[PDB]
Amino acid sequence: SWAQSRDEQNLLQQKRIWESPLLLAAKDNDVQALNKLLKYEDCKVHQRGAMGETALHIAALYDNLEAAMVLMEAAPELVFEPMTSELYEGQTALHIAVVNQNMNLVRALLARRASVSARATGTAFRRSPCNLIYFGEHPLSFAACVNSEEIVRLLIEHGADIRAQDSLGNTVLHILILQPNKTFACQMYNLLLSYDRHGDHLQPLDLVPNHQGLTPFKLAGVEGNTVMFQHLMQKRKHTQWTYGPLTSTLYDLTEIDSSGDEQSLLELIITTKKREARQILDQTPVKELVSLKWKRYGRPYFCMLGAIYLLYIICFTMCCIYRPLKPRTNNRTSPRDNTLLQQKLLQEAYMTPKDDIRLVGELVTVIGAIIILLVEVPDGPFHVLIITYAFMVLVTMVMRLISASGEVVPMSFALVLGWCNVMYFARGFQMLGPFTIMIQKMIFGDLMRFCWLMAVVILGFASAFYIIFQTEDPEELGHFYDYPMALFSTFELFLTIIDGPANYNVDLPFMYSITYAAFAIIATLLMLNLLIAMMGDTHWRVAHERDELWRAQIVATTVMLERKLPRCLWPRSGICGREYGLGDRWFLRVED
Amino acid sequence: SWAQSRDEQNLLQQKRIWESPLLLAAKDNDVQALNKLLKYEDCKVHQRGAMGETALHIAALYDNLEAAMVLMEAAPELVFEPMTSELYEGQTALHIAVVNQNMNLVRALLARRASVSARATGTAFRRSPCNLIYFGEHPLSFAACVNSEEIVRLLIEHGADIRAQDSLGNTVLHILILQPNKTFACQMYNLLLSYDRHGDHLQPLDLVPNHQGLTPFKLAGVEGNTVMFQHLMQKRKHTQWTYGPLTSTLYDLTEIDSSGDEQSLLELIITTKKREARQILDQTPVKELVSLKWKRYGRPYFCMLGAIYLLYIICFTMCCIYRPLKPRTNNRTSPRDNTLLQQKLLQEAYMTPKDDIRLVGELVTVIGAIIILLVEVPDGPFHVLIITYAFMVLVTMVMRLISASGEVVPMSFALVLGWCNVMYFARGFQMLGPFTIMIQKMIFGDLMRFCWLMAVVILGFASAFYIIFQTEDPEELGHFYDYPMALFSTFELFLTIIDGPANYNVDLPFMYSITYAAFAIIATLLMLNLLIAMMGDTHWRVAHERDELWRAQIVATTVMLERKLPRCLWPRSGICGREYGLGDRWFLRVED
Ligand SMILES: CCCCCCCC/C=C\CCCCCCCC(=O)O[C@@H](COC(=O)CCCCCCCCCCCCCCC)COP(=O)([O-])OCC[N+](C)(C)C
Ligand SMILES: CCCCCCCC/C=C\CCCCCCCC(=O)O[C@@H](COC(=O)CCCCCCCCCCCCCCC)COP(=O)([O-])OCC[N+](C)(C)C
Ligand SMILES: CCCCCCCC/C=C\CCCCCCCC(=O)O[C@@H](COC(=O)CCCCCCCCCCCCCCC)COP(=O)([O-])OCC[N+](C)(C)C
Numbered sequence A, B: 001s002w003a004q005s006r007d008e009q010n011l012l013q014q015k016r017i018w019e020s021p022l023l024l025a026a027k028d029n030d031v032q033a034l035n036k037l038l039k040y041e042d043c044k045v046h047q048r049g050a051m052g053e054t055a056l057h058i059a060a061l062y063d064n065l066e067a068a069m070v071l072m073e074a075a076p077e078l079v080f081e082p083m084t085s086e087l088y089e090g091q092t093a094l095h096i097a098v099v100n101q102n103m104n105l106v107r108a109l110l111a112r113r114a115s116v117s118a119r120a121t122g123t124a125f126r127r128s129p130c131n132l133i134y135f136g137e138h139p140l141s142f143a144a145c146v147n148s149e150e151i152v153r154l155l156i157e158h159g160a161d162i163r164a165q166d167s168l169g170n171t172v173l174h175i176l177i178l179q180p181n182k183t184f185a186c187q188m189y190n191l192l193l194s195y196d197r198h199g200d201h202l203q204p205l206d207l208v209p210n211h212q213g214l215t216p217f218k219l220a221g222v223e224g225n226t227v228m229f230q231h232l233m234q235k236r237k238h239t240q241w242t243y244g245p246l247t248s249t250l251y252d253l254t255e256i257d258s259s260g261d262e263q264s265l266l267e268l269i270i271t272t273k274k275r276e277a278r279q280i281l282d283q284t285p286v287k288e289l290v291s292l293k294w295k296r297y298g299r300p301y302f303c304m305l306g307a308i309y310l311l312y313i314i315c316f317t318m319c320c321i322y323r324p325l326k327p328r329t330n331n332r333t334s335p336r337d338n339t340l341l342q343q344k345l346l347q348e349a350y351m352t353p354k355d356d357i358r359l360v361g362e363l364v365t366v367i368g369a370i371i372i373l374l375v376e377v378p379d380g381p382f383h384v385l386i387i388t389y390a391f392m393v394l395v396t397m398v399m400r401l402i403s404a405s406g407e408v409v410p411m412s413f414a415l416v417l418g419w420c421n422v423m424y425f426a427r428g429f430q431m432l433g434p435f436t437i438m439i440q441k442m443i444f445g446d447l448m449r450f451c452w453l454m455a456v457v458i459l460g461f462a463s464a465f466y467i468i469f470q471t472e473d474p475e476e477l478g479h480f481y482d483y484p485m486a487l488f489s490t491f492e493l494f495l496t497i498i499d500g501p502a503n504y505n506v507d508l509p510f511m512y513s514i515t516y517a518a519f520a521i522i523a524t525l526l527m528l529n530l531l532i533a534m535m536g537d538t539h540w541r542v543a544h545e546r547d548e549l550w551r552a553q554i555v556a557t558t559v560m561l562e563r564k565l566p567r568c569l570w571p572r573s574g575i576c577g578r579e580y581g582l583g584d585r586w587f588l589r590v591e592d
């Protein structure tokens, strides 16, 4: 795709260099070739390359100081020229010699007054999975990322703005957090903060947001950058006293905790795809904050909601047990017809006092289903299940009003969805909590991958079992009497939850005993135990990280409860200042 | 709670320091600020802080020697002042400068005659989970715990009592055992014992009990402090001879073995919550003592009690097999009534010689149940089971006398509790012993955690299965005919111990085949194998430490048998002295 086009422009770049004697002598720094071409005609001194590059760009790429100096003496207006293509738009040779860390050639270009504010907006510089570097857009950003302490100072002396932002809004401090070598990126962060002696007014530059709204501290939390997180936390950390081995430590807790309705650090870490962002939860001020919110306010409000939900589902269950049924009016159509009862009409469903007790429970059920929709729809997996529950309750309400047959099908969905939603409240308990993570990763992991191989063995053998018994009498062996039942029976024989079809009083077809023996080996022995071996591996992986997974469950529940409860009902965690003379900020004390 | 109040008093402390110029200059040692405030008015020289602290307390906290000396020259009566709050009651600055290890400021306070006997009874010093340090109450105790060898000597030279006890009764030697850095605590133990040259009469101070009764040696065993246990065992260890690589070693065995009716080291280690106390059992004199008690006296007396219990339960079983039954008098009420026999009245239960043989076995059963209560009630898990057994035997005795119907329900409990109590005697065998620890940790571990998720899937699907078949004829498919049976059937279908409901001669409801397929996947495949994967992990953890767990089972059995058998029947283990001229102490010889 774009990779194929980037491959072709890279080969087109090397061709145009070989086609041009100037670009070739710029690549391989033959001084005698460059001297002859310039003492001749212009020879395309402003030659536009394949990448939009010039000759002075080329000597910058290939680390050719002696070539680049002769090209600057030849034409000094090339120093200001930007590279002109979609890949490398607005890139100067000052950008290139910075990235190549060519110390003598950056000093030479700054002597010829190369711009330090030149923005490199080409798509090879944008933050994308296709690019292997994200350095920003400015030369100061590029030198900060290749860890060149000598070049960042020279750019600042020549007037590079430390406050310059790229198209994503990131300053140079944001970009350093996005870098793979974190320990070098810490030291460059400390260097660039030291040059914010002026301009700390109107923003201190460690507090600038990007276009997502993130400061460098919140970006370190969101990106899973734990090394930069601990280093940024030192600024927000205050030592209160030291009593030998003890230390009382006061944490700032402003951007960490939900200071406003805008998403804080706890919500952004839960609502992100990055697995390594969850490593911020066992960092020190974040870990005791989550535990404090849960024990004081999270777990009491959650256990109340689980108790109310459990009483409500018991109420819904009893209305389904006592659903209005009467003896059937019509006669039995076939001997296969097994139905004895049918559901009452609306006019006769409510005529006794026991029907009035059920009516109260049915209204409590319907009112609860509306409140589930009013909480959840005006906006997870249990998110979908409780909406699917409340939808099924309203469907059976509509069928009750218009007297529609088949209320058993919305109720049966609603019974199993209503009671399996109680497993949501297992996360109030630490031992019970990651059990449902095991169930999710066994369903949407092991089952969804291996059901396709199971379904095709079931389809093969049920089709074989169907045609083997297609000529036989079903009254003796009716497991495969029609093709939907044959398919359901083979699924049950797969799971060994029904017995193998046997009638010793008749002769079964010869082909059955061979096919069922082949089925018993591949399906019940091999593939069934293969799946169980997978799910035991899922169990082992989730139980290994179960404390970390439970803590991530607690934050998501705390973020959700704080979002839905009133602010009077959820007090802010920690200790506010300003009655102790600390400002209006809410602090958290940790004694270690 | 108290943590929130401790957080607030810590912030209130820092405010009152900032409110006071004296306390602020005491915190940050500005000598010019302290000089001006004292050459002015008193300026609250006896200013009471938030923690009950004074200015001289503050210079002690923040390691301000130059501040504290000026404050002592200003008012020397502050040197004697205690900190006055619930957190830090009776704390002096001599306490603080000791903990901060400020060597020049402890010498200055002792020059101004600061008390070495001052007790710090505040709740921040008490042994509690809320506190991170337990240092005791005296300055000598505090210097011993921060490992300051130079300060403990200076306190002793000024008259600090090495025999001072805190509110828990602990001397300084007890407190050192309770310290996290054991290797430093060994060296401080050796230092403080050297200053017991005088006063070894009336107690040698390594033999002082605390209020629980524990000496430092027994506290090292109870607290799991194996490093201090081995070091204390050197004093109780006597080398008898050395024959090249051999060494005959005589162990004192006084506090280890049950010298009196007061609890010894073996009973205290079993009857404690700490898992690391069980690490004392594989230390040298304790390990060969337990093996000696078991092989000589433990295992023969235990195998006799297990043989007698096995013969007794066989006697109880045969009386239940032969329980008095007669043909039923009334007629069959419904076709669902299956009962053919009923239990006899008392007057006809004993009329044949075979009824007389059973009467002897029933009295042997009743006498055994009374003896179980007389041994166990005038005081574990098998502790509860054998009492629950003997209660069920007396309940069926009462029902036999008053001719109450339903003796089958107390007997059935008594049959399964009586025979499962034979698994108690599996610990007489090392290979069989930790099997019952696996069963306990699979029941009260894996089952009690995961039954709640299982129960709610059973409740959801049994309710669905009940309403699906609520309109059908039960004679064809009666698994779910009423709601208790539907719930029991779904439990059995969960465990795959009954087959899936099928009748191929009728049409089952459409909703059944979908719901049972959903049930077969989530319950029989996924959640059932999830539990088995857990219990296999419990099996793997218990089988890894199975020798250590079996040895802990042997001590508990030995402690229980010694407590219940007469002293003539349980001889003291090891070799008494005084016929070999060693004193009256009982020794144990170990050749290594
Ligand atoms: C994850 C789930 C995967 C799917 C699992 C299983 C799917 C099951 C889902 C639904 C089935 C249940 C719905 C009932 C509908 C009734 C119609 C019927 O099927 O039978 C009809 C026949 O027609 C057929 O036999 C069609 C089946 C042929 C091939 C099936 C492959 C389709 C799925 C491919 C997916 C591949 C994916 C696998 C991997 C790529 C009529 O029944 P009869 O009694 O035979 O009448 C014949 C009358 N006669 C006597 C004259 C002869
Ligand atoms: C996962 C792998 C396991 C697969 C299991 C087996 C592999 C399959 C390989 C091959 C199967 C070959 C099919 C036979 C074709 C001829 C049909 C015929 O003549 O039927 C005749 C029988 O005649 C016979 O008995 C056939 C001779 C023995 C074949 C079966 C033995 C398989 C042993 C395998 C050894 C282990 C190999 C695997 C080791 C692991 C007549 O039948 P009838 O008795 O009169 O009944 C009448 C009913 N009917 C007419 C209505 C129909
Ligand atoms: C670890 C163990 C956990 C519990 C597991 C299972 C508990 C099982 C324990 C005991 C059950 C067995 C005792 C028999 C008593 C008979 C009464 C009866 O139940 O049926 C009665 C109906 O009334 C009901 O249907 C009540 C049930 C509704 C909801 C059940 C939830 C209660 C437990 C919540 C705990 C949640 C904990 C889970 C996680 C939070 C009558 O029967 P019927 O035939 O239907 O009559 C209807 C007549 N009709 C035809 C007119 C319609």
Ligand SMILES: CCCCCCCC/C=C\CCCCCCCC(=O)O[C@@H](COC(=O)CCCCCCCCCCCCCCC)COP(=O)([O-])OCC[N+](C)(C)C
Residues within 6 Å of the ligand: A409, A451, B508, B509, B510, B511, B514, B517, B518, B521, B522
């Ligand atoms: C753990 C997850 C597994 C869940 C398993 C299944 C998921 C459930 C999802 C959805 C179930 C939807 C319910 C149907 C609602 C309409 C009712 C209806 O019209 O009935 C009609 C049939 O009409 C049909 O046949 C319906 C069309 C097919 C639905 C069933 C195929 C499910 C395939 C799923 C593919 C794999 C998906 C999952 C892959 C893993 C009439 O019924 P009847 O035949 O005439 O019988 C009469 C008896 N009765 C009137 C007394 C009642």
Ligand SMILES: CC(C)CCC[C@@H](C)[C@H]1CC[C@H]2[C@@H]3CC=C4C[C@@H](OC(=O)CCC(=O)O)CC[C@]4(C)[C@H]3CC[C@]12C
Residues within 6 Å of the ligand: A305, A308, A309, A310, A312, A363, A364, A365, A367, A368, A369, A371, A372, A375, A376, A380, A381, A382, A383, A384, A386, A424, A560
């Ligand atoms: C007539 C009255 C008494 C009915 C009783 C009402 C309650 C039983 C209902 C009404 C609203 C419900 C709540 C609506 C929203 C949610 C969020 C929901 O969150 C998720 O499932 C999202 C997280 C995830 O997907 O895992 C969990 C259930 C809960 C607390 C519900 C619990 C049960 C509640 C309190």
Ligand SMILES: CC(C)CCC[C@@H](C)[C@H]1CC[C@H]2[C@@H]3CC=C4C[C@@H](OC(=O)CCC(=O)O)CC[C@]4(C)[C@H]3CC[C@]12C
Residues within 6 Å of the ligand: A380, A381, A382, A412, A413, A416, A417, A420, A423, A427, A436, A437, A439, A440, A443, A553, B464, B514, B515, B518, B522
């Ligand atoms: C009437 C019949 C046909 C209904 C079919 C039942 C299934 C569609 C239901 C019943 C139980 C449900 C499951 C119950 C519990 C979970 C675990 C749940 O896991 C989590 O949410 C992870 C934990 C976390 O979010 O912290 C994801 C949904 C899932 C698999 C549910 C998916 C839908 C299931 C399989």
Ligand SMILES: CC(C)CCC[C@@H](C)[C@H]1CC[C@H]2[C@@H]3CC=C4C[C@@H](OC(=O)CCC(=O)O)CC[C@]4(C)[C@H]3CC[C@]12C
Residues within 6 Å of the ligand: A507, A508, A509, A510, A511, A513, A514, A517, A521
């Ligand atoms: C678990 C496995 C890997 C170990 C070896 C077992 C199978 C390879 C063997 C054991 C029993 C054998 C079966 C025993 C009896 C028969 C019946 C025989 O056909 C008959 O005579 C049946 C009567 C009829 O056709 O009606 C065909 C072979 C078959 C299925 C045999 C096929 C091969 C089987 C399954």
Ligand SMILES: CC(C)CCC[C@@H](C)[C@H]1CC[C@H]2[C@@H]3CC=C4C[C@@H](OC(=O)CCC(=O)O)CC[C@]4(C)[C@H]3CC[C@]12C
Residues within 6 Å of the ligand: B305, B308, B309, B310, B312, B363, B364, B365, B367, B368, B369, B371, B372, B375, B376, B380, B381, B382, B383, B384, B386, B424, B560
């Ligand atoms: C008519 C006569 C012959 C009846 C026979 C009497 C014995 C069969 C009974 C009487 C007292 C019983 C003992 C009473 C107390 C105990 C302690 C009990 O200890 C525990 O279960 C506690 C440890 C734990 O909980 O694991 C184990 C069974 C045992 C030895 C009992 C074994 C069976 C004994 C010897």
Ligand SMILES: CC(C)CCC[C@@H](C)[C@H]1CC[C@H]2[C@@H]3CC=C4C[C@@H](OC(=O)CCC(=O)O)CC[C@]4(C)[C@H]3CC[C@]12C
Residues within 6 Å of the ligand: B380, B381, B382, B412, B413, B416, B417, B420, B423, B427, B436, B437, B439, B440, B443, B553
């Ligand atoms: C008539 C029916 C309804 C009675 C129900 C039977 C259960 C209540 C009983 C039968 C077997 C019993 C179990 C048999 C063995 C053990 C192992 C036992 O493990 C230990 O004591 C650990 C070993 C040790 O102490 O060294 C704890 C009790 C437990 C789980 C028992 C708990 C109670 C159980 C499950």
Ligand SMILES: CC(C)CCC[C@@H](C)[C@H]1CC[C@H]2[C@@H]3CC=C4C[C@@H](OC(=O)CCC(=O)O)CC[C@]4(C)[C@H]3CC[C@]12C
Residues within 6 Å of the ligand: A447, A451, A452, A454, A455, A458, A484, A485, A487, A488, A491, B507, B508, B509, B510, B511, B513, B514, B517, B521
């Ligand atoms: C083990 C799993 C993860 C792998 C794939 C198996 C299931 C996804 C498939 C295999 C067989 C299928 C069943 C085959 C037959 C039927 C009957 C069909 O309804 C009927 O026509 C039955 C007749 C009646 O309603 O009375 C409804 C779908 C269902 C349950 C199918 C649902 C999906 C099943 C369970």
